[PDB]
Ligand binder design. Structure first.
Ligand SMILES: Cc1ncc(C[n+]2csc(CCOP(=O)(O)OP(=O)(O)O)c2C)c(N)n1
Ligand SMILES: Cc1ncc(C[n+]2csc(CCOP(=O)(O)OP(=O)(O)O)c2C)c(N)n1
Ligand SMILES: [Mg+2]
Ligand SMILES: [Mg+2]
Lengths: 542, 545, 97
């Protein structure tokens, strides 16, 4: 028989989802069987639900849609933080929540994973502020409801929630005939012309793209737009890699007064600003020290936009960006700034923060994804120029530590052809380390750098440098894979203290695409990237 | 200067809280300083917030109040599941959430740990259904609000939430003079008489106590009540240890048709039932196969109660229980059931599920706390008769796996004098293992048993025995302490396969109160306790499509 | 008796000689009134102390009176006494040789 479960999974396939993450529970076991049965879908079970949600997020970043399964109550509430972060940074993640049979829910029984008040509706209500759509399925409404919420996902690319009762998943349904889901047109045409007219006229334009571009998988569009026009472009760190950074007209990262001076001056002296899919947050604008004059700026976002301080409500974000290709006779004839590409020369000097990122920039290769956790790692890594056809994952808005580990793994699963490089701090790894199990099981091959600086350095840089709450128990990080059941034919463990050692291990790792690398970097506790020396004083000010 | 932060901490001290758990963030630093400076309060920082919330829960179970600190957004939403579980099973836990300066909140800025919509109120709203009280403090309302919510904690013993903006924590306030927190116009007096009258008349009464007794730390009251009267008593597994199981009138655990036959027949043939602080859940009543006739039953709970199917609204739960001691001419002169307890003789036989718990029952000592995770561990461990002055932690209502690890540690910190014995499955340990760090730092000495049965056995017993979703990556659990930086003078690591090895390691562990034990038990995947053989079929029956 | 009143949670076991008990025996009255439950062992070696509780108005619901001469009797009465925390025990030991 064909079932509602089948329907949901086929729908998920159409979104391009090939793996589903999560954690089994009694109320999602039968549907879990259905995932197994579907040959076009693979189950990748996590250690915990929070990790699952983070891993789905990372998967969404790369695959451009994702889904994970939890169990009612304990599962969904564990994952809520990761789903929140998917809402905040606008990633299309479906959460499926297996719930008790409708018979049990209607009789209002004191069953496990409830507050023994017979109410089955609390947890969905709690998910309201962090989902674009939600539904409690019934046998009757199932196909309609699945389609409604998956449509909202397509529209907004924010996460959505489906509560799937055991019996509802097993209920009969027909295969979908029509595919999943416009109105505003005259205002799209007007906007395009205004953009085009502005661009032809500008003597020094700047395009700034952001996270929402990644949300809709518009990176290639933007890159092709910038390529034909040769328009100057910069991104925020909130949306690093929304364009190919290897383009000759890409300037670097604009991050308020923390920007490299030349870039700062270029951007802030521009006569026209085209901002696509951008949100200005504290950490992405150098503590709001950005100077982006609204009067010489056209900004487009998913939810809204502005033409020179005149709000638009009525437009289609996705096709409006796509249309940038159908402009004409745009070609920039001006100067840029300066890519001072200088080869890194290592010594036996102990590894410092600034040297690390210099080395990473020089040694990174094409077709790589770089994932960086909040802390020294994000500050250093976000400033790097990526190679051609490379990607970046950071979470500077939501800023949940631990995220990058599962996220890295999810993303890596999403695209086996992109070699992931993870930069996570000791402090953060402690939150989500358990997913090391999955890494070993799924035989994926990321290059993981653990920055062991004996605590939360970024916190030490904001406040309380010598306080005990900034110390963390010191694990032996290199010996972790062995504990989780890895052998040397699966994971290679290193400890790096010097520059030579670092360079050697980087090359060795990139030279071996068949194994995962677990590299423990020893940086000093006092050591922080130049960027953070400043940004930490500014966080304290806030 | 004395500050709001100071006020909050002093109030927390009055509740008997001596440690605060949690995880630093930029919006809760600085208040974190204040915790350090207070000499009567110790900061015990976790790896993650979820673990923190679980650890606070376990602390509450033993200390009878608890508190943990998270950061706005990422911290609080990580912990929500544990706080939910504290609401469900009614534990008095304060969550403190450090938030951005009120200046930033009012200006509605797109700062980290928000949805960049300038709304600072979402997360507290999300906490509504799992808190008895919540508050966003201001410089003005702080003392009032702290007192309001801490009062609600005292009243209901459910968790409460305090959002503490950076600047509000640093704002002036005066030391509290009056302490924290009627009789229901002695409407409790009528109830007591009806209870007393019923008890004098009953030819065969049964007292059933539950989780709410633990919630209010009324265990000793109940024990003393049962002792003087010699009344037959049973608990649900949801509230195991709400009485001293070593009493001669304690019958065992009542769990629907899964109960031992003699107990089952005793309970269900009683002519009068006194249920105190009880909630009948699927897991605690053998999938609702309990037979507790409401017509011969008086039940008292925190929120409500029933005299022979007649609901009462108006009473004070705590003092009503306390008053049971002032009853008089109550003395049970009947028989009990055959509490014939045998002796475990080990062999070189590989360790089986049923044998394990038989051994645990025989080897457990007094003044111990036993913590058991959902799965084979809970099913086996909950049926054990504890020794005198022992305690039990299980979470069969909320049923969040991973809980028992942090919870065990919290509880152990709560009472250094009670030796904790943790029984957690391989599947569950994976959720919360990172707290092993804290265990090593805090130099606490629990006896941890890890039941390595190569996956989620309980799930395998419910549905899909051979499905890949019931397999978990196999870690080398014994070698975990070493990874987390423990030496042999801190943690002792074992692997146990046989009965003799188990007995030996149990005694060795209990003989050494100065080190933590990390014991990996090898049980088969197919192996499950007798109780679960049945209960797993019943779970499947509940979830029949 | 005072100590027992001080901590109801600690079961007192008194070992006193018949000679000495005579000097302060009158407090048996208080023991009965205050319904406290110590285990009193009175070692023999001039009055018949066994039936003293009865004289002071105690019933078998309050005080249990025993005489022990042998090892088995001793073990039995020890366990029986410790098993019953709700009554006072008045145990006369007769020691050999
Ligand atoms: C879920 C969560 N918990 C707590 C925080 C607060 N926080 C932000 S950065 C940080 C320190 C992380 O330090 P580490 O991973 O060691 O990086 P380092 O700066 O030392 O390289 C903390 C505790 C957070 N952002 N998210
Ligand atoms: C947080 C959470 N996630 C998922 C579940 C569903 N669940 C309940 S028990 C269990 C398996 C427990 O397996 P393990 O700890 O290995 O126990 P054992 O094999 O000893 O039965 C699972 C997945 C849950 N109860 N709580
Ligand atoms: Mg660090
Ligand atoms: Mg197991």
């Amino acid at each position: 028989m064909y079932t509602v479960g089948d329907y949901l999974l086929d729908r998920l396939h159409e979104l391009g989802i090939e793996e589903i993450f999560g954690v089994p529970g009694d109320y999602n076991l039968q549907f879990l069987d259905q995932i197994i049965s579907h040959k076009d879908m693979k189950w990748v079970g996590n250690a915990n639900e929070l990790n699952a949600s983070y891993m789905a997020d990372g998967y969404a970043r790369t695959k451009k849609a994702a889904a994970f399964l939890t169990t009612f109550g304990v599962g969904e509430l564990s994952a809520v933080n990761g789903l929140a972060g998917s809402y905040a940074e606008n990633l299309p993640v479906v959460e499926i929540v297996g719930s008790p049979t409708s018979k049990v829910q209607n009789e209002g029984k004191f069953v496990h994973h409830t507050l023994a008040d017979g109410d089955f509706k609390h947890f969905m209500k709690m998910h309201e502020p962090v989902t674009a759509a939600r539904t409690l399925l019934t046998a009757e409404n199932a196909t309609v409801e699945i389609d409604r919420v998956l449509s909202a996902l397509l529209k907004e690319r924010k996460p959505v929630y489906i509560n799937l009762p055991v019996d509802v998943a097993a209920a009969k349904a027909e295969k979908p005939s029509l595919p999943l889901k416009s109105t505003s047109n005259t205002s799209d045409q007007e906007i395009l012309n205004k953009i085009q007219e502005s661009l032809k006229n500008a003597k020094k334009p700047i395009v700034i793209t952001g996270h929402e571009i990644i949300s809709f998988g518009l990176e290639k569009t933007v890159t092709q737009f910038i390529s034909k026009t040769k328009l100057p472009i910069t991104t925020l760190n909130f949306g690093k890699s929304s364009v190919d950074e290897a383009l000759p007209s890409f300037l670097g990262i604009y991050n308020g007064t923390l920007s490299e001076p030349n870039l700062k001056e270029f951007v802030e002296s521009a006569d026209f600003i085209l901002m696509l899919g951008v949100k200005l947050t504290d950490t992405s604008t150098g503590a709001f020290t950005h100077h982006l004059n609204e009067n010489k700026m056209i900004s487009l976002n998913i939810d809204e936009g502005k033409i020179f301080n005149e709000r638009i409500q009525n437009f289609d974000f996705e096709s409006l960006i796509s249309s940038l290709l159908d402009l004409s006779e745009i070609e920039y004839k001006g100067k840029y700034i300066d890519k001072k590409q200088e080869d890194f020369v290592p010594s036996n000097a102990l590894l410092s923060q600034d040297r690390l990122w210099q080395a990473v920039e020089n040694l990174t290769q094409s077709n790589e994804t770089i994932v960086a956790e909040q802390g020294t790692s994000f500050f250093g890594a976000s400033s790097i120029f990526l190679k051609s056809k490379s990607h970046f994952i950071g979470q500077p808005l939501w800023g949940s530590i631990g995220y990058t580990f599962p996220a890295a793994l999810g993303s890596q699963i999403a695209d086996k052809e992109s070699r992931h490089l993870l930069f996570i701090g000791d402090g953060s790894l402690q939150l989500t380390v358990q997913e090391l199990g999955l890494a070993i099981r799924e035989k994926i091959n990321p290059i993981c750098f653990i920055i062991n600086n004996d605590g939360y350095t970024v916190e030490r840089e904001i406040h309380g440098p010598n306080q005990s709450y900034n110390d963390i128990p010191m694990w032996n990080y290199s010996k972790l894979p062995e504990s989780f059941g890895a052998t040397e034919d699966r994971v290679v463990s290193k400890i790096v203290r010097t520059e030579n050692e670092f360079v050697s291990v980087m090359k060795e790792a990139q030279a071996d695409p068949n194994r995962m690398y677990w590299i423990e970097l020893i940086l000093a506790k006092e050591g922080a990237p130049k960027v953070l020396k400043k940004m930490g004083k500014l966080f304290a000010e806030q």
